[PDB]
A paper describes a structure:
The largest of these factors, eIF3, is a multi-subunit complex consisting of five stoichiometric subunits in yeast (eIF3a, b, c, g and i). One of its large subunits, [name], serves as a scaffold within eIF3 as it interacts with several other subunits. Here, by using X-ray crystallography we studied the structure of yeast [name]-RRM and showed that it corresponds to the canonical RNA recognition motif. The structure is composed of four β-strands and two α-helices which are arranged in a β-α-β-β-α-β sequential order.
Two different truncations of the N-terminal domain of yeast [name] were designed based on homology to the published structure of its human ortholog. Crystals of the shorter truncation (rsidues 76–161) diffracted to 2.6 Å. However, they were not easily reproducible as bunches of needles were obtained instead. Therefore this dimer is most probably an artifact of the crystallization and not the functional unit of the protein in the solution.
Author numbering: 72 to 161
The structure:
């Protein structure tokens, strides 16, 4: 019912306003889905500025799904200014 080690932390992700999260979320999900199974993605928001904190959390539904995403996306360039870094959230 409940899984373990399926949560992963992502760093180096675009810091954008809240209204632009839906688009980015769908884009990142489509990307990560290529390598692993994605269940839910969260974009923590900074109350002070109304923008994302730059990092996010990804629930993959299973352990090996989270590890295949980390292995495939860690240290990769999302774009010019952004380079993603992933690791399992203990």
């Amino acid at each position: 019912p409940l899984g373990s080690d399926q949560y992963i932390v992502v760093n180096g992700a675009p810091v954008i306003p809240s209204a632009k999260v839906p688009v980015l979320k769908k884009a990142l999900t489509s990307l990560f889905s290529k390598a692993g199974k994605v269940v839910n993605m969260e974009f923590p928001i900074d109350e002070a500025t109304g923008k994302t904190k730059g990092f996010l959390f990804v629930e993959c539904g299973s352990m090996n799904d989270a590890k295949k995403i980390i292995k495939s996306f860690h240290g990769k360039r999302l774009d010019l200014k952004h380079r993603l870094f992933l690791y399992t959230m203990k």
